[PDB]
């Protein structure tokens, strides 16, 4: 997570707000000074130094983690950006459009913007390239794993923060006294943009016994709940038949059409796109729009604020209306009780913010503050005719103190307890603290329970006994968290391997088409989803697609969901295929692969280096999250549930499940446990609260936490 952050997310944050433009108007009393200036400061490539420390007297020298721990320094490295300074002048002729040209004062030039704290054993740290003897020379423990920061000499671990996933439609039943029966909400977020959260709620008013059950949606920057038919007409789908085609995908779903009839009753007296846009613009909350600009105001709300996770550009009103109709469709299935309300405790609907996303949003906030200070200083200098100094334009102490304060005290801002002092009681205590996760807690859910989707991803019995019971979770041993990849290559691959665009999708002439979602964004439909899923899984098993990408085929709902975002907790599983030679299902991994792994291991303790990446590359193992775990069948062990069917009475009673259609196999079931629970001998012969108590108390043991 830290390597992904430093390698790409820093540059992404710089390049989103790379340029900053200030225009000085002529302010000309006489026509002799009819020139307008345009000063642009542009950020470019970002560079990171090796971890260093500057002393009092200006001496800057390489800082090592042992010296930082001893001297109470921050194990940080400097960040530099390329700054190029464009300046433009124009003849300020009124009426004539201004045309700017360079005066060739294009100065450019690395300048210091702050110190990023470096997590140990990352690609920037000195201990990554160090051998074991080099670690002994540097007085670092070879058993020490890293994973933590050194802030003022204190080892700080960034606890993973559990959050509900964005860009997912979640439908909920409200309370009985409320006039709204069901709410379909999406917390729409975009990763390559302003990172702002917009909540779109599509609410069904009136209870089950009521008659006038209308549906209204809460648009952003709109003070009232706009009816969905009015929103559809503002998006440009006028006829009632076309609106019900966007919402309901079956012509025989007269239950759904009967529930949708009061919506067009409510929205009947608006029959024009500009009438609907004027309605939404009157309900605009800015209250600074004139009479004739409300149409454009509502268009800008529908383009830039309504469902931003789909797009920010114009010309995608059809895509946004299809997504709105899908939201209303899910709301109506839950209202008709064809599906229940979505589970808040489903772990595939959750994301875990590791050190990458947390420092990413923190550095994004701090860099917005830095660029605001740059613009403020530059405006003050050009207004008061002072000299411009870039060392005063950039306050590096902003970034440095922000990162240092948020890593020293767990307050993530300007959420508490995000960063804690690393536990150094025992080695297992340090491992458990480094793999610890946290869930903030006031909703109507029950997040403290051990959910079904927690299998193999978090430990079933490792949690505090106090107020943090169930909220503080610990990762299972083989469980990992995805760092996030770009969905655009997969979207392009879908578009050229048969996913037709949503703009040309007509639901009544494509009743069997499967909807395709990428990171929660409906991009189109596919006629034949099975072979598309086959070739996508073949790419992921051969390594062409990143194995962290999760691909789910819901055959019953006719959906194909692809998730490439960060925060998804996945675990590795064996792959079971047809194996027509032996005539029965069998694991793809064989004794030859096991021998190659053992040969590599014993060479490490001359043949080819056969590794975990190799097993992943010819696809004997697969990365499965809780969402992809819903569409697979897993065998617990290979040599009993794979081959077709006197017993020892001492052995435990085990079922064979009487089903041979397996797609995956557990590697070993002991890996559902965490670090502290894997110390427990025979934990399946214990009562589970006593395993929880030992998982708590193993961190208070005495051993040798580190050899140094």
């Amino acid at each position: 997570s830290f390597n992904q952050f430093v390698d790409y997310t820093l540059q992404d944050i710089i390049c989103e707000d790379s340029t900053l433009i200030l225009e000085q108007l002529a302010q000309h009393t006489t026509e002799s000074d009819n020139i307008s200036r345009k000063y642009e400061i542009s950020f470019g490539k970002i560079y990171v130094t090796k971890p260093m420390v500057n002393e009092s007297d200006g001496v800057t020298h390489a800082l090592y983690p042992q010296e930082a721990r001893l001297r109470n320094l921050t194990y940080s490295s400097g960040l530099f950006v390329d700054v190029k300074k464009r300046t433009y002048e124009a003849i300020d002729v009124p009426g004539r459009e201004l045309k700017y040209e360079l005066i060739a004062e294009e100065s450019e030039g690395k300048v210091f913007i702050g110190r990023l704290p470096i997590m140990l054993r990352s690609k920037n740290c000195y201990l990554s390239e160090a051998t074991e003897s080099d670690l002994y020379k540097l007085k670092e423990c070879p058993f020490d794993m890293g994973g933590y920061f050194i802030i003022n000499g204190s080892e700080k671990v960034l606890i993973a923060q559990e959050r509900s996933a964005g860009n997912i439609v979640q439908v909920f039943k409200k309370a009985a006294p409320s006039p709204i029966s069901h709410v379909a909400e999406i917390r729409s977020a975009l990763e390559k943009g302003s990172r702002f959260i917009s909540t779109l709620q599509v609410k069904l008013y009136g209870r089950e016994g009521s008659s006038a059950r209308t549906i209204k949606a809460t648009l952003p920057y709109i003070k009232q709940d706009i009816p969905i038919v009015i929103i559809f007409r503002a998006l440009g789908i006028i006829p009632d038949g076309e609106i019900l085609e966007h919402i309901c995908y079956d012509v025989n779903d007269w239950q759904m059409l009967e529930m949708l009839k009061p919506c067009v009753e409510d929205g009947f007296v608006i029959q024009d796109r500009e009438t609907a846009l004027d309605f939404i613009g009157r309900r605009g909350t800015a209250l600074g729009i004139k009479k004739e600009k409300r149409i454009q105001y509502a268009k800008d709300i529908l383009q830039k604020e309504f469902l931003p996770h789909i797009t920010q550009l114009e010309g995608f009103e059809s895509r946004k209306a299809f997504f709105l109709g899908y939201m209303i469709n899910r709301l109506l299935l839950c209202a008709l009780d064809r599906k229940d309300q979505d589970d808040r405790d489903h772990f595939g609907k959750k994301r875990l913010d590791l050190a990458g996303p947390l420092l990413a949003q923190l550095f994004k906030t701090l860099f917005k503050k830095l660029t605001k200070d740059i613009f403020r200083y530059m405006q003050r200098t050009v207004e008061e005719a002072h000299d411009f100094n870039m060392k005063l334009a950039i306050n590096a102490k902003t970034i440095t103190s922000g990162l240092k304060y948020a890593l020293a005290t767990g307050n993530w801002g300007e959420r508490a307890g995000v960063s804690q002092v690393l536990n150094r009681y025992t080695y297992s205590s340090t491992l458990s603290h480094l793999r610890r996760t946290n869930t903030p807690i006031g909703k109507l859910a029950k997040p403290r329970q051990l959910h079904n989707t927690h299998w193999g991803l978090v430990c079933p019995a490792e949690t505090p006994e106090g107020q943090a019971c169930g909220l503080v979770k610990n990762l299972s041993l083989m469980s990992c968290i995805s760092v996030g990849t770009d969905p655009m290559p997969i979207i392009t691959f879908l578009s050229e391997w048969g996913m037709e665009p949503l703009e040309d999708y007509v639901p009544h002439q494509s009743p069997d088409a499967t909807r395709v979602f990428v990171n929660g964004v409906w991009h189109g439909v596919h006629r034949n989803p099975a072979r598309l899923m086959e070739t996508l899984r073949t790419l992921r098993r051969k390594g062409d697609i990143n194995p962290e990408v999760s691909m789910i085929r819901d055959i019953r709902e006719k959906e194909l969901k692809i998730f490439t975002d960060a925060g998804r907790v996945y675990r590795p599983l064996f792959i079971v295929e047809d194996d027509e030679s032996l005539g029965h299902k069998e694991l793809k991994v064989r004794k030859g692969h096991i021998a190659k792994l053992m040969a590599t291991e014993y060479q490490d303790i001359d043949v080819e280096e056969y590794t975990w990446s190799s097993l992943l590359n010819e696809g004997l193992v697969e990365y499965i999250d809780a969402e992809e775990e819903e569409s697979i069948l897993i065998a617990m062990q290979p040599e009993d549930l794979e081959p077709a069917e006197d017993v020892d009475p001492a052995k435990r009673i085990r079922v064979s499940h009487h089903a041979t259609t397996f797609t995956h196999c557990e590697i070993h079931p002991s890996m559902i446990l965490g670090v502290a629970a894997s110390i427990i001998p025979f934990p399946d012969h214990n009562q589970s609260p006593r395993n929880t108590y030992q998982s708590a108390m193993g961190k208070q043991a005495m051993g040798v936490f580190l050899t140094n």
Binding site: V421, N423, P464, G466, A696, M697, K699, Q700
Partner: peptide, 24 residues
């Protein structure tokens, strides 16, 4: 300071519940 996993119950600490449920 201290950081212990042994949950010693904070006695005479009912005001957390009082602030949790102040309205009736």
């Amino acid at each position: 300071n201290e950081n212990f996993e042994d949950f010693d119950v904070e006695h005479f600490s009912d005001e957390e519940t009082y602030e949790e449920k102040p309205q009736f």
